[PDB]
Every structure is written in structure tokens, then in C-alpha cells.
Amino acid sequence: DEKRHLYEALLRHNYFPNQKGSISEIPPCFSSRTFTPEIAELISSDTSGRRSLQGYDCVEYYATRYNNFPRTLSIIHPKAYSKLAKHIHDNWEEIRFIKENENSMIKPDMHADGRIIIMNYEDAETKTIRELNDGFGRRFKVNADISGCFTNIYSHSIPWAVIGVNNAKIALKHWSDKLDYFQRQAKRNETHGVPIGPATSSIVCEIILSAVDKRLRDDGFLFRRYIAAYTCYCKTHDDAKEFLHLLGMELSKYKLSLNLHKTKITNLPGTLNDNWVSLLNVNSPTKKRFTDQDLNKLSSSEVINFLDYAVQLNTQVGGGSILKYAISLVINNLDEYTITQVYDYLLNLSWHYPMLIPYLGVLIEHVYLDDGDEYKNKFNEILSMCAENKCSDGMAWTLYFCIKNNIDIDDDVIEKIICFGDCLSLCLLDSSDIYEEKINNFVSDIIKLDYEYDIDRYWLLFYQRFFKDKAPSPYNDKCFDIMKGYGVDFMPDE
Template sequence: MKLNKHDVLSALLQHNYFPMQKKDRDEIPPVFTSTSFTPKVAKLLIDTALKRKSEGYDSVCVKLTRFNGVSRDCSIPHPLAYAQLAFCISHNWVKMDYITRCSNSQVKIKKYKDGRLVVMDYDSSSFQRDSKNIKSILGKRFMVRTDIANFYPSIYSHALPWALVGFSFAKNHKPPKYKLEWYNQIDEKVRFLKRNETQGIAIGPATSNILSELILTRIDEKLSKSGFIFCRYVDDYTAYCNTEEEGREFIRELSEELSIYKLNLNINKTKFFTLPQPGLDHWIILLRQGLPHKNKLSIFEAETYLDLAIELSYDYPDGSVLKYALKSLVGQNMYVNTRYFLIGKTLNLAFHQPILLPILSKLFENIPSLHVKRFAVELNKIAHINAINRHSDGMAWALYYLNKYKIGIKPDVAKAIIKSHDCIALIMLYLSKNPTFQKSVMDFAKGLKSSELYDLDQHWLLLFQLFIDKKIANPYSDNVFEILKEKNVNFIEEG
């Protein structure tokens, strides 16, 4: 069914606002939600809230950890700035929906059952994602893979009008004379999410996917007209060619098209392969072969399988090897002692890879709540090390379990969380209901200077929660918080 502007607006505000794009929505704990941020409330915000003139807004930074331990900065934009962009996209959706018809892109922008526009399958094998293209690659002898260097931070906001209405037309219809034209309004609203900067877009909300597709779909159209057979997953390109020279021509033309929009290829990740290639990455094949298939999983079988996965994770550091292996085991029927073994093993591995922490949810659900307290030391250690390393997801998930199962947070852990200044982690510490820790969080919030608007924006989600709980006064001189509170908006749902 074709997306309409109302579907787009509702999805952007209520379902794809926070950086929760994976199938399981497990980038951050499930206490965070924007379902009460309805189009009606957002419209009221736009119509009645006091707005900044030119400096724009900053965002809450959420540092999500990759498999190799490197963090990826995602954003939760200020609600007023985000509402303005969401409405601008929705209002002009009919001029932008060409991105939903791009056959080359494997990221499908559509209405999903849970209301989202974008669901990303980051964890699947790159070769597996290409398997749907088998018919189109029949007879091809070579494959070339490449991606765009530093993609989202390199997107130039002024390039969006170039993609929307054409380079020459956009150049001849620039602000200030044509400031109110819809394509220039998209540019302006994008900049207002990031301090009015022209370089880079806020990653996390579905707006980032829509905006990037606006540019890359235009590039895909040019490459397709040249006769290339290729597919694209976000900014990862795979082309199928008859000769190696054709592959090199694809790289040359792609590079030229990207340069028009001030983007560059990542030469270090440009590789050529002879066909055929396996439909799955090698580590997936090995893990599937090694997966135990007995009626009940034993400790020995689980340990042997995870040892294989650990070995493979060193050979394939960019793959989701350990996550794949643990998820394969968690869904199996197992002995009680095997479940406790898996919990201990997952905690041990999560100390090194915080991305594994969400897997504990299902494991903890299948043991008595009181028994989760046995793992208090491990969860506190994980929270502490992630506070030191400034990993938002590692801190948030560890604190989520400590809060959910009423396990005490150690004072040194709380101190490290406060020191991290991480907005998401500070909220989770506040939700512990520990009076001492709550006071520390409130003292931190009160220490933010109201004159430093960007500092406030980087913690707006925490400040708003404290405001609606009547712990602090509105730190802003505008009325955004008052409007949201009056309309019963709450971005935290403890359940």
C-alpha cells in the first residue's frame, strides 16, 4: 500500500523518533518511547512554541557500540526542531516519495506493522542480503563492493535541494530570495537539527534514512541508466559485472556521481571478487553447521558452540558473530543449568561487546526474578566499564536490568555514570529511585547553565523528565516543555 503523508508524519514522530531501527528495537532499553508525541501535539508545538532565530538546536547524543567496540554517534533531536522537520517532510511527501520506488535500495521505506517507516537489518550477512538478486546476476563473472566514506557526517545539507529539484534549478533558486520554497525549507529544517550546520545530518531518527535516500536514489537512477546491475544497502554498493574493467567503470561513474553531491568513495573498502561467491558469509555457514540439534541443550554443547563462535569472531571482527551464536542458542529448549551457564557466558562476553546485552532479556525472563540478583556484581561491572568507555547502550542496558530486578547500583558505578554526562545513562540512574542517586542527577541537571542552550539541548530528554516530575523548573526560556507536559507527553514508559 502506498505511503501517504499522514503515515509518514505519524511514523516519524511516534515510532521512528528514537534510534531504534533494528527489528527488535533493542539499541536502547524499551523504557524510551515517543508514542505520545502525536502529530496533533507536534503541530501545537510548531504553532505556539517560542522558536530560536538562527542558531538552531543540538541533540541528545546516544553512543551505540558496534561489534568491534567502536561507538557510533546517534541522535535524539530536540522535539521542536524535529517536529518542524517531520512536518516539512510530510507536507512535501508526494514530491519525495520517489525514494520508495528505488529497486536498487535494499532499505525499504514503507509502513511496517509496528508503525515504523524504517526497519534495518544491520546484523544480517552482506552476501545474504544480495541473495534476492540471483536472477539479475546470472552470467556475470565479477562482483565489486564499495561504500561511501564517512557517509552520514559527510552529507551536505545544501545538496538536498540539488537532489530534489536538480542542481541547476536549485543553484538558481537559493535563499534568501527563495528561502520559503519547499526544497530550501527541507535544507533549513535539516540544519536546525544540528546547530544550523550544513555538514552532516542527525543519525538515528528515520528522517536520516529519508534524507540520505533522497540523494542516493538520484545516484542510483544515473547508474541504472548506464546499464549497471547493482544493489545498495544504505551506503554499501555491490555491482555485478561481465569483466573486471566493467567493475572499474562502475567505480569511476559512482565516484563521479557522488562527487556532485560532495561525497566520496571509501577506497580502502573497494574490493573485486570473481563469481560465483557463497550466498552466506563463511562464519554463518560454520555456525550453522556447528549448531547443536538435540532435544535439550546441555552446558557442554552450548560451551563448545560458543567457543567456535569466539574463535570465528577474531577472524571476522566486523561480523555479528557472537550475537548470531547467542541468539541461535537462546531460542532452544535447554536444561535449567544450561540457562544459568548462558547467562554467565553472555555477561562475560557483553563486558567486551555491549551490543550483546539485549540478549539477556529473554534469558532473565526464564529464571525466577530473585535469581537475577546473583548477577549483581557482573551487571555493576558492565555499567562501570561502559561509563568509563562512554558507551551509552552499555550503561543503559546494564542499569535497565539493575532497575528492573531491583538490584542495588554501587556508589562507584553511580559516580562514574554522573561523570560520563551521558543523557540516556543519567535517565536510567534517575529511574533507579535511589534518593541519593536521584539527588546527584538533579544536581547535575541544575548545574547546566540556562545560557548555554546547546548544553541544555544535549540533555533535553533528562531535563524534560525531571521537569514533568516536578524536580526542576523549566531550564529554557521558551515554552516547549510546558506545552508537552500540558498534552501529557512522556518519553519514558517504565512499565
């Protein structure tokens, strides 16, 4: 069924931040499968325990963007998440109108892997044909962005999108009001904001933005939405300015607004992709597939020169993720002579740009890591940099490389891994079991605070220790106990 596929997707696949489909933002050690929908029903049914704080906090995760900026992905506390996912499942026949929207490019969809939200998933041919087809006969292309979107979505506006603003205000139960309550329970009983990364917040965002899409559609606008980005194709500048006005009205009705540093009108014909994308692909040494693998295999100077050219292009343009695109272009066709050189270049690029650390997972088997302890000092210097810059995805990926490849990790860099206080980093140090006593000091400092929001901020670490019998639950409810009795592990093996 599609209800069952959504129920699997909300918990087994898209609970953790898993929207990016090329490389994940979270290392593959953390997996949210075995958190089955029946365990979510049992958690929702459980009513024990008393909480002194309204709502639940989230395990935080600062992922690095192309400009090294942090984006705070969140792992919802699972007692607050099981109710939210179960509510979205039970109400799916009244929610699936977001699937029938045609202006939302990334939306819930029955993906084969098990997910429902995968950004940048559709193939290049259809994307090109759509871009030309919608750019047919038009003069201007308007790009608009919602300012926060994740930051300031109003949860009380979830019924406003569903049955209208004034009908919902008069009505103040309906399914969308309980959805608003359950979404609020996900993040500290707070009206504004949604945790970034779970598909439940993507569904909540799609529900609110589908009314905006409906009103923009009914006024005859050619437009597409990519999460919070609206692209409009306009025969004249009348359409260009009036779409911006109507989008501003429709967002302001649901308390949202437009990012005016991201608004720009560009005369068609522009570029189907961004300009740096075609600059890289035109100069890519892999741009032609030769149908024989020896020809497809690249040389040392070819890959290195393309990587230098990508570095200059990112310094000179910087409009997008130039390094990640360029590295994905050359990463899978490396010859054995290249692997050490491109590996060290990736070490250089991963230090300077910590979002490039996941690509280091491709080469680690082919590179002989023992060497003369060069890579040993490299990964620790990266770990120190990720501790310094407060970057969670680079820290977690580097620690996944350190435990998976058994490379030792220094004490002084751990002094800042423990002091940074990223939860997912501390779960990796927790799964190592060598640093049991520095982990114990941190969790004891959390418990001695007697602040439930900090325990909810480190619920993944606390649950991993409780499931590994190294600690008891810090909660008086049965949620951790129902998780552990059924075998829920958020750091599972194969």
C-alpha cells in the same frame, strides 16, 4: 493512509534510534510513542521564546558495533524535530519518489509495527533469490561504501538531488530548500551531517542517494544499496572499474565520496552472506528444526561448545558480528539446565563485548537473580566497564536491567555514571528517584553554563524532570509545556 502512517512513523516509532529490527539499540524503557503528530503540529505552530544559538543540539548515544567501535546515534531536539517531521509529512507526495526506487533495499516502507525504516528486515528466502538472480552470469562483485554518509551529507545538496544541481544553484521557496533548513535546524544549524537514528535523516539520505541510484541505473548497472553500501554485479572488470568511477562522480557531484578502505572486488561465485555466517550456520546446533520441541531443545555442552567455537571464529575472522549472530542462533531454544551456564557465558561476553548486553534481557526472568549477590556485582562491574569505555548502549541496557530487576547499584560506579554524562543513562538514574541530588548537581552545572547546546544535549533528561514536576523547563519557549500538557512521556509504562 500512507501519509498518516509516515506521520506516525516519524514520531511515534522512528524518532528514537529504532532502525535495527532484531534487538533495539535503545532499551525498551525509552519509547517515543505518545509523541503524536498533533503534538508535533502544536509544537510547530508555537513561535514563543528566544534562542541565542542557531539550531538545536541532540541527545547523544554512542552505540557499540561488532568491533566495539562507537557510532553516535542522536535523538533530535523535538522542537527542531516536529518541524522537520511535519515538513516531510506535508511534502510527502513530492518525497515518495524514494519509495519507488528499486536499488535502495532499506527505504521508507509501510511496516506493520509502525516503522518505516527497519534495516535487515526482509526474509532470507527473498534475499537469497535476489542475490542469486542478480549474481546471474556475472564475474565480479564490487563492494563500495560512502565514507561518512551520515557524517558529511551536505544539507544544501538536498535541493540539488531534488531538482538538479544547476537548477537549484540558479534558484538561489521550494519544498526541498525548507527541508534543507529544517534538517540543518536538527543539528546545531550545521550544513554537514545528519543525526543518526531518526527516520527523517534516513529520508534525507535516501533523497540525496536516489539521484545517484537514478544515474547508475540509467547507465545499465546491476547494483543494490544498503544505506551507504553499494554492491554491483559485473560481467567483466570493465563494469567493475567503470561502476566505481561513475559512483565516485555521482557522489562527488553531491559532495560525498567513497570509502576506499571498504572498496574491494571479489570474483563470483563468492558467498551470499559473509563467510563467517555460513561457518556459524553450518556448525550451528540449531541448524535443523525437528518439528518437536524436545528435540529442538539444546543441551549444556552443545550450546557452550558452539559459543566457544563462535569466540574462536570471531577472534580468527572478525569480519562481522559473529557473537551476536551465534547468540541469536541459540538464545531462544535454551533448556532450563542451560540457562545458568549460558547466562554466565553471556555475562563473560557482555563484559568483553558491550553490544551483547541486550541479550541479557531474554534470560533475566528465568535466572534467579537474588542468589548470593553474584549478579549484583556482575552488573555493577559491567556498569563500571561501560562508564570506562564510554559505551552508551551497554550502560543504558545494564541500567534498564538494574532498575527493572530491582538489583541494587553501587555508589562508586554511579560516580562514573554521573561523570560519563550520557543523557539516556541519566534519565534512567532520574527515573529511579533515589539519586535525585546527584542528578540535580549535573543539571545545575548544565544550567549554570548558560550554553543552550548543552541543554539541548540533555533535553531528554531536562524534559523528563520537567514532566515529572521535579524541575522547571530550562527553555523560554512553550515546546516543553505543550508536550507536558498533552502527556508526552519519553519513559512510558504500559
